[model samples]
Target: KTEHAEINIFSVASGHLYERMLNIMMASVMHHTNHTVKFWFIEQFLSPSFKDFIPHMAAEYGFKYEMVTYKWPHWLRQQKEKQREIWGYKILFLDVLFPLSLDKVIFVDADQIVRTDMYDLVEHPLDGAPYGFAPMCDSRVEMEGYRFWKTGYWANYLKGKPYHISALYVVDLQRFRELAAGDRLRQQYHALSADPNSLANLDQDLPNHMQFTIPIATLPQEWLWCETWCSDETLKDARTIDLCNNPMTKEPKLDRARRQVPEWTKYDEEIAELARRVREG
Candidate 1:
């Protein structure tokens, strides 16, 4: 066994709003986990103050942090404003910016907040699979919403079965490079671009399109849990709850109208308490 488990966690944040979430996520992780970690932060644009802020936080928290920028792709730059802002291109370009020496990396969206110690979760074995992710608990069609399924081109990729949520996933870079994962992603992007259908979420669908070709380890729901209208079991089992459901709004939703607001439930209370702890620091 390795002497000590160490992992690299990567997240992309641009603009002030998402940058603030990056801070919240770092603080949340500090409050919960004792793991030795190195954080790789990617940003195409950020304030001068943010560049100063990140290094200070890293020194205070006693963890390694790196700042990198992925040259914006022409194809990605041509995307709609909403699509461009999500930084899905970063997901496709991971192999380019990441060091080949590293064996694995954990990708967590800035919108998620850490709720528990993640060392075990990050270090979980992936056998020989190129990547690891959890299937969406809700059916893909329902989660994508009626309008998206009706008008969107995702039916070309997903057929109402479950799919992985892109908010959090782990990649075995060793296998990824070997399998030419980077090339595969770019090729898929071209195909999606040519198709007449527009997608509600590009990053989520990108991996789903290649899901069958790549061997993947299915993570437990708790590791990739989202705050969508969840069941009792899902809420109770959640380890890291992704706070944002609507990427377009880019804000945390504590309430969902159709179902009783989860904010009124015990799960929300627990999250609130954890958040308070995060804020206290």
Candidate 2:
């Protein structure tokens, strides 16, 4: 295994609210991990104010960060919608998005909060799989009807394999590139994307669709817990909590972040304080 001195986290977000959540996520990651942390962000979606504030946040938090951008290849089908474009950025170009020297990177959703040192995940073996993803939780029995993967097409496609969530995942860049997993994904995407009905959840659906060919290592249940899919009883075991949207109540993400994660407000206030200082200075 290649050695890395810092925990590298990759994430993307747009607009003021998600950017705010991104800051809190960064703080939570830094607070939990003892190792050095470096963040990689998709540059195209970030607001100008976020770009301006990041350096100050880095200075105050004493972590490293880089903004990365990639133009969509002409050969691949393009997404006309902004949200789908962002989703494309998330999974489509992972192979070309970073320096070849980076052996691994953990992709944490902008709306997630870290509860444990991410180094554990960094060191977690993927066996031979190019990447790892946490399976969608089955603990929330009430939400069982909402699990679209359990029936029909996905059920037939997955057979017995678990349906993995895209919100939190670790990619073995070396393996990904070496196996040309990116190429495989793009090829499959090009075919599937021609149909408007397919890939409703582009990033999540694509990877899960290619599970048989590309393969996904199943991350432990405790690695990621979402309130929408996971019960409160398992909250204590969660290494990271993702603020995934609830289909039923449709609670606002900010409300859920504040209500569910106690540390979120503290992180937000800390960042707000830093922003205030940066603004005044």
Candidate 3:
């Protein structure tokens, strides 16, 4: 095994929402993980019409960045599904799991901010699973959406349907790239074209369908604390916090009871304190 872990994040362009998520994620990645980090953007092309300046701005910061482009077939239009929507990113990720040349990759949506050292994250073992998915809180409504989607295909592969939950992911990218090179992981891409309109939704969801068959190291939710599945309690001293707490499909449930909470209170002071530490010299 290599002595250290690399921080690899994969995301697509969806304008500012994703950029915002990327910004905070970058800030957090730098703040906590003290190792080399890379953010790889996936896309078919970057037309002049692309509006968000994040891709360029991310480079201005000290972060290492790159872009990956593939042959997106005709049917994949930006309109039919809400590609701009963050939750819809699951498809891009499915194709990403295997393939792409890197060691370990963590797929995080742009809705979060990191608060601690990320290197500590990769150190946590994933129980020999190809993926390490975070845990989900118990919620009937959220679980139902997950079931309707039927995430994992081969139940006989591992535990029952796994659970309804996730907060980004830590993937085995080297193995993934090999999987991609082997054609074992993505056989369905061609399989579906022949049977399109019948299992119309199948190919796009094959990754989630095979979720249970994959190995995973489930992280304790606190580390990847999302605001969505949280109460006031979950927010306590969290190192990182995404707008939605931990529940994958739904938005976070922040405490509305504390109506007095100030809008900028979340960041302004904390950043200043870090500035203080640096400026103390």
Candidate 4:
């Protein structure tokens, strides 16, 4: 193992909602983890003023941060109209969009918050796999049967195999590129979209299908957990929380979820703490 983990973390944001979510996301990571990290973000729809503030925030938060403009290359553009929602599929583009210098990287959804040391996750072994992530602890069919079947013949053929959630994942760029996984994904997308009326869950579906083409390992649920599934007992050892279930928003259930597992409140405090430092400094 290397003396220090080479950590690269990334997320995608579009519009005001996600921009705010990204603030809490990065702030939480900055707060919970002391290890150095190169943070990457892609902005699809943010106001000019907010966009301009990113650099200032990066300096104050102490992470190497950069905003990337996502675009569809030849293969992606060639896919059918239904499969071209590249925005949601941003994580899949990491092998080509991220800095080539980075051989491996972790991608977290902006809707999540890091509650513990992410360095350990960065150091976690992938066991010679091209990707690693926490599989949905329960049944994929029960969670979203539509998604399970929409992934095309390969996924439906497997008939009840487990799948990793797209919220948090590790991508080994070397293996991804060495085996041409990106091209494989594009082909998968094209194949799945052949149904003229079929809908697509770009982020989740694309990665799920790639399993047949690449090596992937599962990250323990204790490390990457969903907010609803993470009880107070579960949160005690959780390193990251996926807020997709009950995001920190004005949703009525938000209050209930928070009260149930107040551990996530620390990320709010992290963002608040950053306000203090930036205001004073």
lDDT of 1: 0.65
lDDT of each: 0.65, 0.92, 0.50, 0.66
Give the per-residue lDDT digits (tens) of candidate 3, residues 1-281.
25333776765546543444445456556656667777766654333433244444454445676666554444443224444223334443445433434567776655556666666666777666666666554323444453433344433443454442444666665654444521443344445535534233432244444454444566666665544444556666555565543346343223421221333234434444544554573
RMSD of each: 5.7, 1.2, 7.0, 4.5
**What TM-score, to 2 decimals, does candidate 2 have?**
0.98
* Candidate 2 clash figure, as a count: 0
Candidate 2 structure lDDT: 0.92
Candidate 1 lDDT over 137-186, as tens digits, reads 55233344523433445555566544677788888887889999887877
Off by over 4 Å in 2: 1-5
Tell me which residue pairs clash in candidate 1. none
Q: What TM-score should be assigned to candidate 1?
A: 0.76
Predicted candidate 4 versus true structure: per-residue lDDT over 87-145, tens digit per residue: 34554476777766678778888777687677777678888877887876542223444
C-alpha TM-scores of all predictions: 0.76, 0.98, 0.62, 0.78
Error of 1 at 193 (Å): 1.0
Best by TM-score: 2
The candidate that wins on lDDT is 2
lDDT of 2 by residue, 1-281 (tens): 34444689999898899999999999899888779888999998999999988998888777888899799999999999999999999899889998898988989999999999999998999998999999999999999999999999999988889999999999999999999999999999999999999999999999999998898999999999999999999999999999999999999888999899988899999998888887798
Which portions of model 3 miss their true places by more than 4 Å?
1-5, 43-60, 73-79, 82-101, 139-161, 164-167, 178-185, 188-208, 237-239, 245-281
Instruction: Determine which window of 10 residues in candidate 3 has minimal summed lDDT.
Output: 252-261
